[PDB]
Structure formats: C-alpha cells, structure tokens
Amino acid sequence: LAEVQALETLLTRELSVFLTEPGSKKTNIINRITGKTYALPSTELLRLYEHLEQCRKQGALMYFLERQGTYSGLMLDYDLKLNTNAVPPLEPPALSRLCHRIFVHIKNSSVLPEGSHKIHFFFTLKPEVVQGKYGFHVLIPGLKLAASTKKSIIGSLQHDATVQKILHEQGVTNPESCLDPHSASVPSLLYGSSKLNHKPYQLKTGFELVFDSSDPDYIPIHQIKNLESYNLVSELSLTNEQGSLVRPVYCAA
Amino acid sequence: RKYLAEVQALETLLTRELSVFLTEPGSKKTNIINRITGKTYALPSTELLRLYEHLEQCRKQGALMYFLERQGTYSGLMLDYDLKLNTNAVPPLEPPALSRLCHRIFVHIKNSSVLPEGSHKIHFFFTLKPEVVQGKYGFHVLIPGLKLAASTKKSIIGSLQHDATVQKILHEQGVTNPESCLDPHSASVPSLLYGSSKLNHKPYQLKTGFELVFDSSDPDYIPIHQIKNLESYNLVSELSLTNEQGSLVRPVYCAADIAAEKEEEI
Numbered sequence A: 001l002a003e004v005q006a007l008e009t010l011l012t013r014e015l016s017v018f019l020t021e022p023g024s025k026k027t028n029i030i031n032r033i034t035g036k037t038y039a040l041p042s043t044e045l046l047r048l049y050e051h052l053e054q055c056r057k058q059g060a061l062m063y064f065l066e067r068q069g070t071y072s073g074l075m076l077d078y079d080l081k082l083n084t085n086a087v088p089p090l091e092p093p094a095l096s097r098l099c100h101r102i103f104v105h106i107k108n109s110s111v112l113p114e115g116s117h118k119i120h121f122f123f124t125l126k127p128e129v130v131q132g133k134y135g136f137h138v139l140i141p142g143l144k145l146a147a148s149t150k151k152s153i154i155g156s157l158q159h160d161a162t163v164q165k166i167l168h169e170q171g172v173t174n175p176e177s178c179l180d181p182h183s184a185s186v187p188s189l190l191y192g193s194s195k196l197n198h199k200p201y202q203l204k205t206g207f208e209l210v211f212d213s214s215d216p217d218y219i220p221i222h223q224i225k226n227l228e229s230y231n232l233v234s235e236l237s238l239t240n241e242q243g244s245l246v247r248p249v250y251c252a253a
Numbered sequence B: 001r002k003y004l005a006e007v008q009a010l011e012t013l014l015t016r017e018l019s020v021f022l023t024e025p026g027s028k029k030t031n032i033i034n035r036i037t038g039k040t041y042a043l044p045s046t047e048l049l050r051l052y053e054h055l056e057q058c059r060k061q062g063a064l065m066y067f068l069e070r071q072g073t074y075s076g077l078m079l080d081y082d083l084k085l086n087t088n089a090v091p092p093l094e095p096p097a098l099s100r101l102c103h104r105i106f107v108h109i110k111n112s113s114v115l116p117e118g119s120h121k122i123h124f125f126f127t128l129k130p131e132v133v134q135g136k137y138g139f140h141v142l143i144p145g146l147k148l149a150a151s152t153k154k155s156i157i158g159s160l161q162h163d164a165t166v167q168k169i170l171h172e173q174g175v176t177n178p179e180s181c182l183d184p185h186s187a188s189v190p191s192l193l194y195g196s197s198k199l200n201h202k203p204y205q206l207k208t209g210f211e212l213v214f215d216s217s218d219p220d221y222i223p224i225h226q227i228k229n230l231e232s233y234n235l236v237s238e239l240s241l242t243n244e245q246g247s248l249v250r251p252v253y254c255a256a257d258i259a260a261e262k263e264e265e266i
Helices: A001-020 A040-055 A092-108 A145-159 A163-169 A232-236 B004-019 B043-060 B095-111 B152-160 B164-172 B235-239 B258-264
Strands: A029-031 A035-037 A062-064 A069-079 A116-125 A133-147 A202-214 A221-223 B033-035 B039-041 B068-069 B074-084 B119-128 B135-148 B207-214 B223-227
Touching: A001 A232, A040 A232, A069 A145, A069 A221, A092 A116, A092 A133, A092 A163, A092 A202, A092 A221, A116 A232, A116 B074, A202 B039, A221 B207, A232 B235, B004 B033, B004 B043, B043 B164, B043 B235, B074 B095, B074 B152, B095 B119, B095 B135, B095 B152, B095 B164, B095 B207, B119 B235, B135 B152, B135 B235
Parallel strands: none
Antiparallel strands: A029 A035, A029 A062, A069 A133, A116 A133, A116 A202, A202 A221, B033 B039, B033 B068, B074 B135, B119 B135, B119 B207, B207 B223
C-alpha cells in the first residue's frame, strides 16, 4: 500500500535519527510493531501525524503509542463490563454530561488559567463488545496538566456518583471500578492504533467546552460538527501543541 | 520462471491456514505479522513449521514476502547491527572474524547463568543486507535455537555494546561507529522471516553460519565450526527465532520467568 510505503520511508530514511534507547525519558513516540522508540521534535511529530492520518483513513494496521510524561493532555481509559453484548447507546446527552462532570474535577484541581479558554473532549469507542467487555477513551489533548494533577482528577472521577449513574443507565455493571487509575501514566494509543490482538477505537463524538473565570457558572458544551476536516491523529494527540482545532491551554504545574 | 500461479496458490493457502489463528481479545500474544495484508496471527509452535515450509517455497520462487516474527518474552537471540563504513566499502566479514564474534557473544550468554545443564549445539547465522541505505550497511546475528528471556537478551545486548574485543573486530572490518552500531532494541524488534523484506527494500542474505557446542561440565571448552551445507536446509525454518521444529537448529531452552517477563514487557 502506497501510504504504508510512504510511512516506512519517513520512519527508516528520515526519523531513524531520533531513535531513543530503551527506557529513555526523551521518548515521546513508541512504534510497538517495529519495537522502535523516538524523541520527535514538534516539526517531525507533525510529519508523522500526516502519514499516520493517511494510513488511518485507509484502515492500515498501526500500533503507535505516545508517552504522557510529566506535562501533557488528559486521557481517561474506561474498561466496561456490560449487561449484554450490545454496544451501549452512548448518545450526545450522556457523553455531554460526562464532559461536564470531568470538567468539575479539573476545575476543583485549581490549576486552570484565568480568562476564557476552549477545551475539546473526544470519545473513541471499542468497535464491538466481546463477552460483555466494552471500552472508551476520553481524550482532552489540549488541556496540558501535570501528571500528579491527572492522578488527582482520575481519583476524584472514580468516586463521582453522577458518572456512576450515567454508566449504570448505559448497562455498565462495574461503574465503581471501570476507570483505569493509571490513565495518567500509561502510554496512550495514537488515534487509528491498537494492541495487535484488538481493533482501533473509533471517534464517535467530540465536544467543545468553553470556561470563563469571570463567569464560572456558564460552561457551554457543544458537539464539534466538522471533525472530518481536521487531522484526527494530530488533534487527538495528548503531546501535540501544533493542532489546528486543539490549541493548548497550559495549567499550573 | 516468474511463478505467478504457484505464488498465488501459496498466498491463498497461507491466508486460509493462518485465518484460524487471527488474533482477538483473549487469544495468545501475536507472534507472526504479514505487514503487506496488515494481518496479525498467534500460531502455536506446532503450526509454525508448516508456515515456514510455505514461506520457503515462496522464497525459492522469488515472491516478495513481508512476514515478521515477534520475539515476545521468550525466543531466539537476534543482534541488529547498522554499520557505518568508509563511504561504500563492503566489510569482508570472513570466517575467522565472525567465529571470534560468536565466541564473545557466547561468553556473555554463559556469564548470564541461564544455560541449561548438559551438552548443546548452538547455531549462529550472519545475514547481510545487499544494498547500502544511507552509508549504513545492515548485518543480523541470529541465534534462533537459543531460547532466551527478553530481560537476558537486553543484558547480553548491553554487554556487547561495551565489549572491547567486539568493538576491535568491527573497527578492523572498517566500521566507524563500533560504539553505536548495535541496536539497543535488538531484544524487542520484529525479525523479518528469511526472504521477507520492507516493501521496496531487498531481503537480508545468509553469508555464513557456525555450530558452537557448549557442555556445562566443561565450560572452558567452546568449539566453533562453520556449517558447510546451509542451502540444503529450509532456511526460513532454521533461521526463525520462534521455531522449535528445525532439523539443523534444535532448541536449547534457557531459564525464563515467563509471567515476570510478560509484566516487564509493558
């Protein structure tokens, strides 16, 4: 396939010069198929994302991970046990309410900057239920958080009664223990990538949340309408700072 | 002479025979990747040899294969050298230099204290990439039969990077990067099955192979002999890091905490 050939040429001819040693801290990108680790500067990260995005649109086998490190976007990994083997509905109102509750915990961490800021939430879903096992990722890639703050936010989210209700009404039988408490530290799959035994999560719905420190009770959440218009590998990346839709908002460390 | 039909037949057989091993949630860890079709398979060791016989037939008929085997947590050793030469100088890599390389590699294996007791034949194979990519000359050392824990491979690779005798040997071959030519991911990288390659790159070529005999009772006696009749064997089979049913290469099983190794493979 042409776009896979293009990605192969980019990796071997050009990005090979950024190969990191096993257990390096400069590592930001992991190709688990080739077992290679890279520290890509922002320019070369984008070039990678353009190739991965072309490969994604053609359904190519990818297993790319990004390392969250100490300061990056927030990822929530939900591992659901369901009532049935039917994909739960997860319609915009349920996902919208999830975003609001997630935000209440972010706000309560006290690290948000003053002023008016857009933050984007993306929900990628396991394509099918297997033996009642289901999953979604919540990506807030633009909201740059300290690892310690992510862990704190995740701790609070596990105990959220409203979130547990939403998940229960979706048919989740483990609403108390479905959020991976290591969501803050685990390497995070790039959009279109998966473990070699699984299929890649699919973007169902994204939301734009605007917060304003001057008007704290006004928290508008709206579906993003022209998602297809953007490079989704790029926009959904927790470590990217040069997205078009997703512009970074820097939280206190 | 272009075996269009026979290769197509083998491709259909492979897709059908592999289809039952297509990886899924709850299935075993993928060990075989067909990078052309992007399909991932978990073959029981029992079925690997049948795959290797089909890939060997495809190789001998000049088919462009792109099969990888995954090393996982327990498999044969593979050392991935990217050598920087004087512009486009091809290193001689004659038997005496390669023989000494085997000896040094073995000293680190022995020092790891994972070898099983008794007498064992351990086969070393040297494959070289025919073309220079970017002044880089590619060069694999395969010990496919010596089944090692990933953690032991990483340890052996670390020792080989800092081995003064190995650095000398590489230097005398015309290598200008003897300190940074050994890929520190050598333990985790996929291995192309013999005759497979990246889509427009050319396959690695077997130059020369050695039989080392080790005996736990007599550890200072390390006879190494060039193998003479290499083309007589199924080379996909014998060179495979995951194979256990080779004819030339009989597996020697080193100590591994299999579950521990699977936790450390994060």
